[PDB]
């Protein structure tokens, strides 16, 4: 008399959690992009577990916390990660920048770095940031064509189609 578990075939869990980061460092994001997917449910002996899921990340500059504790972006910019030595956790920040070419000489701005306090995290974000909103900067090869089309129309649009006309970019500074 073996008790077959409810999650045996064919009634297993179809969809897995997929908890963790959903954008890597230096990636460009805009408000609403989910930087990290997380859940509220917590294991009953967490301090003894070892899988990387159980240990959540922390919001930082220009990042919000969702209802299920997802970390989502709040400004147009590029992702950066930081390590908090005091709390021994990872912190997700977004450095605000307008869309432009990501150069090799600028990649150091998105290195993962060690900090002791969130004040120092903000200081480091300011120091690595490219420019401020009130002064702006000279954009190096900024995009000029309209954005990719909605997903429900086409999933595989082309980025910066030369056949399309130039349209003003007036949303990536917000």
């Amino acid at each position: 008399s073996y008790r077959r578990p409810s999650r045996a075939s064919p009634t297993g869990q179809a969809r897995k959690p997929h908890v963790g980061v959903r954008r890597l460092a230096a990636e460009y994001v805009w408000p609403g992009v989910v930087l990290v997917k997380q859940r509220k449910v917590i294991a009953f002996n967490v301090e003894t577990k070892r899988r990387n899921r159980h240990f959540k990340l922390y919001p930082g500059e220009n990042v919000k916390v969702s209802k299920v504790t997802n970390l989502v972006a709040l400004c147009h910019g590029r992702v950066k990660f930081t390590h908090d030595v005091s709390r021994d956790v990872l912190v997700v920040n977004v450095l605000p920048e307008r869309r432009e070419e990501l150069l090799r000489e600028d990649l150091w701005r998105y290195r993962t770095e060690h900090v002791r306090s969130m004040e120092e995290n903000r200081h480091i974000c300011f120091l690595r940031r490219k420019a401020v909103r009130m002064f702006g900067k000279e954009l190096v090869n900024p995009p000029t064509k309209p954005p990719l089309r909605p997903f429900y129309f086409t999933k595989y649009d082309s980025w910066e189609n030369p056949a399309l006309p130039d349209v003003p970019q007036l949303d990536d500074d917000m």
């Binding site: 909103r133 009130m134 002064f135 702006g136 500074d173």
Partner: peptide, 13 residues
Amino acid sequence: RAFPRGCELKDPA
């Protein structure tokens, strides 16, 4: 030099 515009200059006045 030119300067980027503020939030006020972007409302539909």
